[PDB]
Amino acid sequence: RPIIAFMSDLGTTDDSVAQCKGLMHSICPGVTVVDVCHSMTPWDVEEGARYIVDLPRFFPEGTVFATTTYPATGTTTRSVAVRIRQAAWAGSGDGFERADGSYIYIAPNNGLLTTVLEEHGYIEAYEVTSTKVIPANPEPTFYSREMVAIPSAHLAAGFPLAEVGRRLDDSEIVRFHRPAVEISGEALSGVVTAIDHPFGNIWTNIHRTDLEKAGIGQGKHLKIILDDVLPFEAPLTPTFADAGAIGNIAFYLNSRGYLSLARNAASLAYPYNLKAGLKVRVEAR
Amino acid sequence: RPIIAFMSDLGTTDDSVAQCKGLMHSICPGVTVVDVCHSMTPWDVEEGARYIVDLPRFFPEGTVFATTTYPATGTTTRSVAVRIRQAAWAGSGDGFERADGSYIYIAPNNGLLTTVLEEHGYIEAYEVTSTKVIPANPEPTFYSREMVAIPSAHLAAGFPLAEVGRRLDDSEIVRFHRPAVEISGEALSGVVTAIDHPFGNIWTNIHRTDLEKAGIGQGKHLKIILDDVLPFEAPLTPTFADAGAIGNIAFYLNSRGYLSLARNAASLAYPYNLKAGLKVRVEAR
Amino acid sequence: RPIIAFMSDLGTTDDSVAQCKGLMHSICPGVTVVDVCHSMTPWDVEEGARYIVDLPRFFPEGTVFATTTYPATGTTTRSVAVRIRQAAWAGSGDGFERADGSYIYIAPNNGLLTTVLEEHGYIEAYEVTSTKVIPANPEPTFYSREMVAIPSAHLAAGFPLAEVGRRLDDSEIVRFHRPAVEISGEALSGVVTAIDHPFGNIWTNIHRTDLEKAGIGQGKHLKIILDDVLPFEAPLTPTFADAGAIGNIAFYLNSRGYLSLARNAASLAYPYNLKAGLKVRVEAR
Amino acid sequence: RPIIAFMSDLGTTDDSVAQCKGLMHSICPGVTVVDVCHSMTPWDVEEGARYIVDLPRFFPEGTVFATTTYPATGTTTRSVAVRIRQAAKGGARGQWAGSGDGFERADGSYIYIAPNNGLLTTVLEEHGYIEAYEVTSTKVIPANPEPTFYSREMVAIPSAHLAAGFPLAEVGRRLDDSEIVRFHRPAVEISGEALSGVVTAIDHPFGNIWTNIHRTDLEKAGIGQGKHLKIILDDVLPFEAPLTPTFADAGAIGNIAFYLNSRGYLSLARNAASLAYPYNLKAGLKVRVEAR
Amino acid sequence: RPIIAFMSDLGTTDDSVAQCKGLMHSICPGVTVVDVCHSMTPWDVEEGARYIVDLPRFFPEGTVFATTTYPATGTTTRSVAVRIRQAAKGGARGQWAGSGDGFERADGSYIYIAPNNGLLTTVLEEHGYIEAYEVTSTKVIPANPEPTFYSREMVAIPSAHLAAGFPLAEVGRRLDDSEIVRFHRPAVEISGEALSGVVTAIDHPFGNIWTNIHRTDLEKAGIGQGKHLKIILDDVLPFEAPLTPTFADAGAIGNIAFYLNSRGYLSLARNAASLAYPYNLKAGLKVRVEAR
Amino acid sequence: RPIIAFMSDLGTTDDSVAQCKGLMHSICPGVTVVDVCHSMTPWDVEEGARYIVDLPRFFPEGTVFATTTYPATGTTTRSVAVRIRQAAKGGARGQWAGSGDGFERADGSYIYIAPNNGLLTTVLEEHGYIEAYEVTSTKVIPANPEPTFYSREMVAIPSAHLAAGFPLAEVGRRLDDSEIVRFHRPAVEISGEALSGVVTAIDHPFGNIWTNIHRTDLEKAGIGQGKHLKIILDDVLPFEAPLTPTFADAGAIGNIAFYLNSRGYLSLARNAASLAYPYNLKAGLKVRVEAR
Ligand SMILES: Nc1ncnc2c1ncn2[C@@H]1O[C@H](CO)[C@@H](O)[C@H]1O
Ligand SMILES: Nc1ncnc2c1ncn2[C@@H]1O[C@H](CO)[C@@H](O)[C@H]1O
Ligand SMILES: Nc1ncnc2c1ncn2[C@@H]1O[C@H](CO)[C@@H](O)[C@H]1O
Ligand SMILES: Nc1ncnc2c1ncn2[C@@H]1O[C@H](CO)[C@@H](O)[C@H]1O
Ligand SMILES: Nc1ncnc2c1ncn2[C@@H]1O[C@H](CO)[C@@H](O)[C@H]1O
Ligand SMILES: Nc1ncnc2c1ncn2[C@@H]1O[C@H](CO)[C@@H](O)[C@H]1O
Ligand code: MET
Ligand code: MET
Ligand code: MET
Ligand code: MET
Ligand code: MET
Ligand code: MET
């Protein structure tokens, strides 16, 4: 039962995604295509990375991840196809253990896989050039279809990964550089990485382990200032309801393990026009 | 061929729904996940109820409905899993008769299933606590995944419903209270329950049976006033085209059996900024 | 492995599409429903046509296309079901050749299939009236479900096309009339047919063959004026990156073969409030 | 104590109006410049016309009206300056303005000066005029006018000379009536028990709705105070109310009121609430009026 | 050289204000009409009140304040005209306005005329008054007032007669204090180290935030210049800053400042940046003040 | 008949401007306060500068310009008051304003008073000045200025004393030229057949586009009336048109026009249509000009 999990910037308003799915079913009969999302901000490689970095442990072994925003479409660039190592457990009971090397990502070689590779490691990476799995005459503006969707379907059908093209050195895989959290005492500086739609919760790049280094744990009183102006105060709690009344401010670690801000069953970011990229300062005593 | 029909407030812009689907396929290989919608207004239990109340007759028997907006995520609350009684026919010819007790809903116990239970009745309801079908260590902020998606997949795989947890008394199932239509002569008062996106038609809580009690039938001339200010007049007709010219006002019973307002092949609500919650007054003579 | 590719104006915010899919699975067990899109501008038959005209070559033979915007819902009108001739190749290598007569469209008879029929031709067309494949008592406002979704599933299950109703003459199939490109020297006049969401690229009705007639080929310097006011200049290039710096203007043939405008990895239409329908004038020397 | 009442499309965000006023004071020391408004939709002469046609009876005799939207600035066109005949009564009833029984205004006692582009159409129609002149004399306009600023050069500057007592007939040659540009207004159509017209304006900042159906139109149709009416907008919104003097007659806050506005025309509104703004109702919607 | 200071809800987009001014000049030749503002939210008497309560000390004695939002226009209601007692000192400190030590204003030297609908509540509260009269004499209002335009008929027109020297006591009968409509304002609540109040206004066009906590409230709570404060908005935004004279005392551009505004009330802002606009902060948010 | 021309960032929605005017009349009875505009973007001194630099030639000699955006209000800063030298000619051609050949203005005949924060940069640059003084005397400012309201305390109030004839040199000590704060403006870059600059302003309410390329810049580049030009905005929109006197020279309504604006700078627009608004074109876009 092959599965392709599909994340793109192709949108939800025309036939772009369906063209890809038709070909996926053409190449791999009985494939199941699971949509991640197709509404990421176009060409925002760091935003796309967030939508795909923690997928593996949720999916059956052998799942292929087709992940793409392709602003360099039509150029001599070629996609990269990678077998990751550690799935890094979700599910009922104690969850579902996944064996190493059980997932393949295929994407533009433009940094999209940066955090996937950082968190999971990888066993082998190849550039995708073989006309066995890509068109001999690719549509210049549609590499998300030609260089990702189509070869992802061959990989799901069991095309041997090592035959898609030559093996890449680690230096040939493009990566983006994320801003580091800055820690001084129990005072941390970071950024808003995302507005958690559709709730308007606010996600930061400050991880649980950053909090731990600052001696911040559950129940610690925090002050969080956004963009050096807008202040919030709350204890660190497991979840939204811990803020008490509807509308109250909660500080919590999100399901990804990162410090987040929210109103309890109300939207925090939207009424204040808050967006990703704002500076975050965290203070505890 | 097991089917899970999935309705959530999780949105369409990140990997939340895909995490659920991966696990559903992990737990129930060969399951088909049919998306209802994932864009309901967060925490609006009455809006969610509308999207799920009339699903059963459309689906093959044995379908599991995973339906969730979970503002109490992370608390000691537990989901409820319910086998409904009457499917309450759709399809070609005279439609498809569905046997009693053929569908299971699983949802937060927060009133989401209120109208499902009212229209279909139910045979048996259980709280979902067994670590055979939920995580032993659930992600606090993600009960829509942990307490709905994951156990819905076990139920679809044939996990016995009565083993998910203890059986609930009817008093333990939370319900919301809907405002009643008020009837005086052939004058009715109700509310706008929904803007019918993407058309901008206007749906009210005034049912066919309310109209019947007021002696209002097909062709009756009506005056409908919204929010005690904005007036419309038309005869009650079966459909949009019966208004005549494009843009003309039609009054009709929607596919759910409720009195609705529309412009013929044009949007009524959007140009006038009309939204759910407005008072509705209906007058006939 | 039957496939229905589903394009509608039913939206993504309620249970409308799921009601259709439930019935499709009810009628054709093991069917795969592939969503094209459901967010087309309601009742815009020319916009819908664009989303479905080039689908066939992407899909396995035997695929049924269920395509619908149905403003005449509830009237005596009946859908048309058509076996097209030429699929008109996509895929790896030299692509996937599709045999003639391998696809069926079913749609309102309201012009939606106009360009499908123009580009592919057709072998046979029927009105859909048999209560073997439509309801004996159709919901007046829901013909997209009753007259398209339901019979599309019977066709996918192998219901013989010629038995859905009587065979239509070509004169009985409604068509819309598209505005023609006007060519004078190497000066062309057309219109913006679409904003290419989510990128904000601008698509025109000026085809590669129109450019060829004007002696315009790759590298030719063009001036394009929108709405007789807003000017742009660039050489014709294969793709976005050929504009050079991020934000620079590119002129290119889109994946459909039509002259298009874009900023390189930035949105052209949105900052300038540009929308479909604007006049397009093209000048070369 | 001369007065220039100044209506333009120059806006309120830069020094354009002040340049005009500086010059008005330079030419007519002691002048008072009374702003009408400066926010009209640029180049909409029919909107501009509504802001100036009712002014004369409110002002002291001798007042000069400098009124201008000038899209033909810098061309060979020249402004028209005109002495009107009747100051004219106005309002829901038709009366002189002021305390007591109001202030009767003498004939021939106001001058309008404007681009000759139709801006004065309803001024001339409602007030009549004695003689009209094109404005060409370099005694009252620049010898070398700023091409893009005729609202200053050909309206503000000569209006101040006129306010200072410069003889109107010496601004340039007399115009024939046929040389005066006019726009054409939609007529009200009248059946016995009914009337059709149009929304002419949203009454800012309240959101009241003004139509072109005049008191005299109502009278011809046998409609007077207290008459139960239906007023349908856009053939889709059938409002019902009696014709009343004012908003509060509708009773509760928010209730629909039908009334003659302060210009003498049938209008709709909500009592101390905005009718047009919540529902995006705008000028140009068709109006049907029916006696019930 | 009489002055009428004119505050209305008539807006700045049509000829309504000019009609009023034309009549003011007709009645009081030589008058100067000083616009206060005309953009107040229609029918919001508490907002209108804030625009007029601090005016007297800024104007020459004899100045008449014509202040009006008139949703009851055209009813049997009549305007109130009143001679106030104390011009009153104001500001962050409480002083006379002007150069040097400021200009002391004599008592009984300003008249307000307004709809009797509560608009003058804080004027009367802060200044006191000698006598109040309903405005009924057709010496100073029309015999047949335009029903929808009492702001012109019952405020503008009589204000000009008063400016011209018409005796206040002859405008109509004396009112008892109980006949003067008043609105009720939220009181500041005071604990020893803390205070609760409300945002009364966003200070346009800067986006500063004004509260109802007055200097005298701070003094009662032992809070003076330099005191470290917390000001929490909407029980969700806990701003912290010392109380300072002005914006630049916050240091860097964009930093939060707490200060007494020019009306004497505790306010919050950013130094040469907008506080309220980027975050959609609006009047009505709860305020909690704490000494730190 | 003294005049104060008043430009501020105080806005048009509350009583701030009226407080200033009340005081101006208190100090200079008989003064006329001519509003320039009050809607400038707060604290944008370069925008404020554009609203005041062209004023002098339009006003009678002796006119005082009170011009203020004051983000440093309440600090030790003091306003600068200055007698300018040349009133200066202006416009597309460079001429005196007014009828006939215009009104020549004497030197040394206007005073500007402003925060010393660069607001007067282009005023001083284009007009020159005789002497500049810091404003400190309590004869003309309050002994105890309202900390947040220096636009009133340190500009409005002393401007009225100056209008009343108070000797400029007695407002405080003479400043050295180096003590006058200035902002720095982008220079136009000139190649033989081409020029680069910037959009300085959108011309509201029309949506015309103003650049910093001056008539004298065009002359240096050999560009005169009728010259076929290309003007590229943001290196993405290559407009083409001949240089013409005015908008209507473009022919049909909506056609692109290139012209020298009333301030003397190269501008782009559509003939009786808005260029900038439909496409969200704003100040700050780069400009390239090419002779064709
Ligand atoms: N204007 C554009 N500039 C650069 N890349 C684009 C543009 N429009 C679409 N694309 C890219 O083309 C890809 C499809 O091949 C999409 O994933 C998208 O990132
Ligand atoms: N700010 C919030 N307050 C309460 N519940 C939330 C919030 N954000 C997301 N959730 C809920 O968490 C659920 C996922 O477990 C979603 O269904 C959603 O209802
Ligand atoms: N107001 C309306 N007027 C005409 N058709 C409509 C309207 N609302 C929905 N529909 C149509 O009903 C169809 C469903 O049967 C949709 O495809 C849609 O086109
Ligand atoms: N782009 C434009 N096209 C035509 N006329 C204009 C334009 N911009 C301003 N004007 C006109 O110039 C006049 C000033 O002379 C204004 O009254 C205005 O109507
Ligand atoms: N729709 C309305 N309802 C009540 N009062 C109104 C309305 N429109 C304008 N007014 C009032 O009429 C006054 C003029 O007499 C204005 O001050 C204003 O407050
Ligand atoms: N938040 C603020 N920061 C700095 N200056 C301000 C602020 N609000 C108003 N001002 C200034 O105060 C002046 C009045 O003294 C105004 O001209 C204005 O520029
Ligand atoms: C991504 S834009 C170019 C590729 C294709 N035409 C599409 O719209 O998806
Ligand atoms: C619903 S918010 C918390 C759960 C998860 N992080 C999500 O975004 O869906
Ligand atoms: C398309 S509107 C009428 C059909 C159905 N009620 C729906 O909302 O889709
Ligand atoms: C309307 S163009 C003439 C006015 C002047 N050019 C300005 O706006 O500054
Ligand atoms: C506020 S209604 C009175 C004013 C007048 N009717 C107008 O707006 O023209
Ligand atoms: C710009 S702050 C000084 C003005 C005054 N505080 C006001 O806005 O009322």
Report yes or no: B93 at the C interface, CB cutoff 8 Å.
yes
- B264-270: list long-range contacts, CB under 8 Å, 24+ apart: B264/B240, B264/C71, B265/B240, B265/B241, B265/C42, B265/C43, B265/C71, B267/B199, B267/B200, B267/C42, B268/B200, B268/B201, B268/B202, B269/B195, B269/B196, B269/B200, B269/B201, B269/B202, B270/B200
Q: Is E203 in the pocket of ligand 12 (CB under 6 A)?
A: yes
Q: Which amino acid, D121?
A: T
β-pair type (C187-196, A32-35): unpaired
**Whole-angstrom distance, CA of residue B262 vs CA of residue C73:** 13
Question: Residue A53, Cβ neighbours under 10 Å: how many?
Answer: 20
Nearest to A193 by CA among A180, A184, A202: A202
Instruction: Say if residue A96 is in the same domain as residue A224.
Output: no
Instruction: Say if residue B165 is in the same domain as residue B29.
Output: yes
**Whole-angstrom distance, CA of residue B276 vs CA of residue F127:** 62
* Tokens linked to F273: 């249509």
**Whole-angstrom distance, CA of residue E285 vs CA of residue E268:** 13
Question: Residue B175, Cβ neighbours under 10 Å: how many?
Answer: 15
F113: Cβ contacts below 8 Å, ≥ 6 apart:
F64, F65, F66, F67, F79, F80, F81, F82, F135, F155, F158, F159, F162
E230: Cβ contacts below 8 Å, ≥ 6 apart:
E238, E239, E240, E288, E289, E290, E292
Answer yes or no: are the C-beta atoms of D100 and E143 closer than 8 Å.
yes
Q: Cα of B32 to ligand 9 centre, how many Å?
A: 24
How far is CA D281 from each of CA B119, D203, E14, E260, rounded to the nearest angstrom? 41, 11, 18, 43
**Whole-angstrom distance, CA of residue F290 vs CA of residue F222:** 11
State the smallest CA–CA distance between residue F128 and chain D in angstroms.
Answer: 20
Question: Residue C269, Cβ neighbours under 10 Å: how many?
Answer: 24
**Whole-angstrom distance, CA of residue B106 vs CA of residue B150:** 10
Q: Would you state the torsion angle of the CA atoms of residues D220, D223, D225, D231, taken in this order, to the nearest 10 degrees?
A: -120
**Whole-angstrom distance, CA of residue E73 vs CA of residue C43:** 48
* Tokens linked to C242: 């050929």
Nearest to C188 by CA among C220, C161, C219: C220
Per the CB < 8 Å rule, is C273 touching F256?
Answer: no
Per the CB < 8 Å rule, is F55 touching D19?
Answer: yes
- Greatest extent of chain E over all pairs of C-alpha atoms, in Å: 62
**Whole-angstrom distance, CA of residue F34 vs CA of residue D33:** 9
Pick from E30, E149, E157: CB nearest D98: E157
Residue with structure tokens 């004369």? D56
Q: Report which DSSP code applies to E95.
A: B
Nearest to D148 by CA among A240, B207, F261: F261
Report yes or no: D110 at the E interface, CB cutoff 8 Å.
no
Nearest to F92 by CA among F235, F249, F233, F207: F249
Q: How far is CA D209 from the centre of its chain?
A: 16
Q: Cα of C111 to ligand 11 centre, how many Å?
A: 51
Answer yes or no: are the C-beta atoms of F258 and F231 closer than 8 Å.
yes
Instruction: Say if residue F101 is in the same domain as residue F173.
Output: yes
Tell me which of D132, D152, D185 is where a domain ends. Answer: D185
**Whole-angstrom distance, CA of residue B112 vs CA of residue B174:** 8
**Whole-angstrom distance, CA of residue E288 vs CA of residue E189:** 10
Q: Is D151 in the pocket of ligand 4 (CB under 6 A)?
A: yes
Q: Cα of F152 to ligand 12 centre, how many Å?
A: 9
Instruction: Say if residue A190 is in the same domain as residue A162.
Output: no
Point out which residues pair with A6 in neighbouring strands: A35, A66
Answer yes or no: are the C-beta atoms of D244 and D259 closer than 8 Å.
yes
Point out which residues pair with C184 in neighbouring strands: C187
Point out which residues pair with E256 in neighbouring strands: E270
Ligand in nearest proximity to the CA of C196: 7
**Whole-angstrom distance, CA of residue D251 vs CA of residue D253:** 7
Point out which residues pair with B271 in neighbouring strands: none
Point out which residues pair with B188 in neighbouring strands: B183, B282
* Tokens linked to F229: 């030009």
Atom number in ligand 7 closest to CA A14: 8
Instruction: Say if residue E168 is in the same domain as residue E241.
Output: no
* Tokens linked to C213: 């007639």
| Positive or negative torsion for Cα E235, E237, E240, E245 | negative
Ligand in nearest proximity to the CA of F117: 6
Per the CB < 8 Å rule, is F13 touching E204?
Answer: yes
Instruction: Say if residue B120 is in the same domain as residue B218.
Output: no
- Report DSSP letters for chain D, one per residue: --EEEEEESS-SSSSHHHHHHHHHHHHSTT-EEEE--S-SPTT-HHHHHHTTTT-GGGS-TT-EEEEE--TTTTSS---EEEEES----BTTTTB--SSBT-----TT--EEEE-SSSTTHHHHHHH-EEEEEE---TTTSBSS--TT-HHIIIIIHHHHHHHTT--GGGSSPBPPGGGS----PPPPEE-SSEEEEEEEEEETTTTEEEEEEEHHHHHHTT--TT-EEEEEETTTEEEEEEB-SSGGGG-STT-EEEEE-TTSEEEEEETTB-SSGGGT--TT-EEEEEE-
How far is CA F4 from each of CA F30, F82, F157, rounded to the nearest angstrom? 11, 14, 11
β-pair type (A3-8, A64-68): parallel
Nearest to F119 by CA among F168, F159, F66, F75: F66
**Domain region containing B68:** 1-178
**Whole-angstrom distance, CA of residue D69 vs CA of residue A150:** 62
- Report DSSP letters for B44-91, one per residue: -HHHHHHHHTT-GGGS-TT-EEEEE--TTTTSS---EEEEES-----S
Nearest to E270 by CA among E261, E257, E280: E257
Q: How far is CA B93 from the centre of its chain?
A: 25
Per the CB < 8 Å rule, is F39 touching D13?
Answer: yes
Q: Would you state the torsion angle of the CA atoms of residues B17, B18, B22, B27, taken in this order, to the nearest 10 degrees?
A: 10
Q: Would you call E200 helix, strand, or coil by DSSP? A: strand
Q: Report which DSSP code applies to C266.
A: B
How far is CA E241 from each of CA C87, E227, E231, E268, rounded to the nearest angstrom? 71, 9, 8, 9
Ligand in nearest proximity to the CA of E255: 6
Residue with structure tokens 């009340």? F22
D40 neighbourhood in chain E, CB within 8 Å: 13
Per the CB < 8 Å rule, is A135 touching C5?
Answer: no
**Whole-angstrom distance, CA of residue B192 vs CA of residue A89:** 45
C10: Cβ contacts below 8 Å, ≥ 6 apart:
C16, C17, C20, C38, C68, C144
Nearest to B203 by CA among B118, B273, B271, B277: B277
**Whole-angstrom distance, CA of residue B242 vs CA of residue B253:** 12
Nearest to A105 by CA among A2, A7, A1: A7
Tell me which of F134, F162, F185 is where a domain ends. Answer: F185
* Pick among E69, E146, E152, E161 to test the D interface (most D CBs inside 10 A): E146
Instruction: Give buried/exposed letters for F273-290 (b at 16+ CB in 10 A, else e).
Output: bbbbebbebeeebebbbb
Nearest to B117 by CA among B161, B90, B80: B80
**Whole-angstrom distance, CA of residue A132 vs CA of residue D250:** 78
**Whole-angstrom distance, CA of residue A78 vs CA of residue A135:** 12
**Whole-angstrom distance, CA of residue F163 vs CA of residue D275:** 47
- Enclosing H/E stretch for B115: helix B114-120
Question: Residue C244, Cβ neighbours under 10 Å: how many?
Answer: 12
Q: Report which DSSP code applies to E90.
A: B
Which chains does E contact via 3+ CB–CB distances below 8 A? Answer: A, D, F
Q: How far is CA E68 from the centre of its chain?
A: 12
- Enclosing H/E stretch for B5: strand B3-8
D254 neighbourhood in chain B, CB within 8 Å: 228-229
Helices (H), chain A: 16-27, 45-52, 114-120, 143-144, 150-156, 208-213
A15 is annotated as contributing to ligand binding: yes
Report yes or no: F279 at the C interface, CB cutoff 8 Å.
yes
What backbone torsions phi and psi does residue C224 show, to the nearest 5 degrees?
Answer: -120, 125
* Tokens linked to E285: 């948010």
Question: Residue E193, Cβ neighbours under 10 Å: how many?
Answer: 12
**Whole-angstrom distance, CA of residue D3 vs CA of residue D21:** 12
Say what the resolution is, in angstroms.
2.0
**Whole-angstrom distance, CA of residue D291 vs CA of residue A192:** 62
Instruction: Say if residue B162 is in the same domain as residue B273.
Output: no
Residue with structure tokens 């315009």? C216
Report yes or no: C231 at the F interface, CB cutoff 8 Å.
yes
| A66 CB-side CA count, 13 A | 32
Point out which residues pair with B224 in neighbouring strands: B232, B282
Answer yes or no: are the C-beta atoms of C113 and C170 closer than 8 Å.
no
**Whole-angstrom distance, CA of residue B272 vs CA of residue D276:** 10
Report yes or no: C249 at the F interface, CB cutoff 8 Å.
yes
Q: Is F149 in the pocket of ligand 6 (CB under 6 A)?
A: yes
B259 neighbourhood in chain C, CB within 8 Å: none
* Tokens linked to E234: 């909407």
* Tokens linked to A109: 């070689």
> Which residues, numbered 49 to 68 in chain A, qualify as contacts with chain B under a Cβ-Cβ cut-off of 8 Å?
50-52, 54-55, 58-60, 63
Report yes or no: D239 at the B interface, CB cutoff 8 Å.
yes
**Whole-angstrom distance, CA of residue E79 vs CA of residue A120:** 79
Q: What is the CATH number of the domain that holds B191?
A: 2.40.30.90
Angle at A16 between CA A12 and CA A17, to 5 degrees: 65
Instruction: Say if residue E87 is in the same domain as residue E203.
Output: no
* Tokens linked to D11: 């806006």
A239 neighbourhood in chain B, CB within 8 Å: 73-75, 140-141
Report yes or no: F141 at the E interface, CB cutoff 8 Å.
yes
* Tokens linked to D177: 């009536």
Q: Which amino acid, C74?
A: G
Tell me which of E131, E158, E185 is where a domain ends. Answer: E185
Nearest to A74 by CA among A120, A13, A30, A135: A135
Q: Would you state the torsion angle of the CA atoms of residues F194, F200, F205, F206, taken in this order, to the nearest 10 degrees?
A: 0
Pick from A95, A198, A239: CB nearest B39: A198
Nearest to E259 by CA among E216, E191, E208, E201: E208
Point out which residues pair with E3 in neighbouring strands: E32
Angle at C34 between CA C28 and CA C36, to 5 degrees: 135
Point out which residues pair with E50 in neighbouring strands: none
D280 neighbourhood in chain B, CB within 8 Å: 271-273
C247 neighbourhood in chain F, CB within 8 Å: 236
Residue with structure tokens 């004051």? F70
* Tokens linked to C57: 């070559």
Per the CB < 8 Å rule, is B42 touching A199?
Answer: yes
**Whole-angstrom distance, CA of residue C252 vs CA of residue A140:** 10
Answer yes or no: are the C-beta atoms of C9 and C35 closer than 8 Å.
no
What is the spatial order of strands in the sheet that E80-84 belongs to? Answer: E32-35, E3-8, E64-68, E111-114, E80-84, E129-134
Residue with structure tokens 């999209």? A112
Q: What domain count does chain E have?
A: 2
Answer yes or no: are the C-beta atoms of D86 and D132 closer than 8 Å.
no
Point out which residues pair with C204 in neighbouring strands: C192
**Whole-angstrom distance, CA of residue C255 vs CA of residue A149:** 15
Instruction: Say if residue F115 is in the same domain as residue F236.
Output: no
F277 neighbourhood in chain C, CB within 8 Å: none
Q: Would you call E287 helix, strand, or coil by DSSP? A: strand
Counting beta carbons within 10 angstroms of the beta carbon of residue C217, is it exposed (0 to 12), middle (13 to 18) or buried (19 or more)?
Answer: exposed
Cis, bond preceding F42 (omega within 30 deg of 0) = no
* Tokens linked to B121: 């009745």
Instruction: Say if residue D287 is in the same domain as residue D151.
Output: no
Q: What is the CATH number of the domain that holds A119?
A: 3.40.50.10790
Pick from B3, B37, B93: CB nearest C25: B3
Angle at B109 between CA B107 and CA B110, to 5 degrees: 105
Q: Is D203 in the pocket of ligand 11 (CB under 6 A)?
A: yes
B263 is annotated as contributing to ligand binding: yes
Answer yes or no: are the C-beta atoms of E87 and E108 closer than 8 Å.
no
State the smallest CA–CA distance between residue F206 and chain D in angstroms.
Answer: 7
C32 neighbourhood in chain A, CB within 8 Å: 25
- Report DSSP letters for chain F, one per residue: --EEEEEESS-SSSSHHHHHHHHHHHHSTT-EEEE--S-SPTT-HHHHHHTTTT-GGGS-TT-EEEEE--TTTTSS---EEEEES----BTTTTB--SSBT-----TT--EEEE-SSSTTHHHHHHH-EEEEEE---TTTSBSS--TT-HHIIIIIHHHHHHHTT--GGGSSPBPPGGGS----PPPPEE-SSEEEEEEEEEETTTTEEEEEEEHHHHHHTT--TT-EEEEEETTTEEEEEEB-SSGGGG-STT-EEEEE-TTSEEEEEETTB-SSGGGT--TT-EEEEEE-
Q: Would you call A241 helix, strand, or coil by DSSP? A: helix
Instruction: Say if residue B258 is in the same domain as residue B138.
Output: no
Size of interface B-D (CB pairs under 8 A): 28
Q: Which amino acid, C209?
A: T
Q: Cα of F272 to ligand 10 centre, how many Å?
A: 13
E81 dihedral zone (left: phi>0; alpha: psi -120 to 50; beta): beta
* Tokens linked to F232: 């590229």
Answer yes or no: are the C-beta atoms of F79 and F135 closer than 8 Å.
yes
Q: Cα of F153 to ligand 12 centre, how many Å?
A: 11
Query: Per DSSP, which regions of chain A are E strands?
Result: 3-8, 32-35, 64-68, 80-84, 104-107, 122-127, 182-184, 187-196, 201-207, 221-226, 230-235, 249-253, 258-263, 279-284
How far is CA A168 from each of CA A87, A121, A132, B217, F150, rounded to the nearest angstrom? 21, 14, 19, 73, 68
- Report DSSP letters for D173-191, one per residue: PBPPGGGS----PPPPEE-
Any contact of D with C, at least 3 CB pairs below 8 A?
no
E109 is annotated as contributing to ligand binding: no
What backbone torsions phi and psi does residue E76 show, to the nearest 5 degrees?
Answer: -75, -5
**Experimentally determined by:** X-ray
* Pick among E208, E236, E258, E282 to test the A interface (most A CBs inside 10 A): E236
Nearest to E31 by CA among F261, D92, F25, F180: F25
Question: Residue E137, Cβ neighbours under 10 Å: how many?
Answer: 17
**Whole-angstrom distance, CA of residue B83 vs CA of residue B105:** 7
Instruction: Say if residue E165 is in the same domain as residue E24.
Output: yes
Answer yes or no: are the C-beta atoms of A103 and A171 closer than 8 Å.
no
- Report DSSP letters for C230-242, one per residue: EEEEEEB-SSGGG
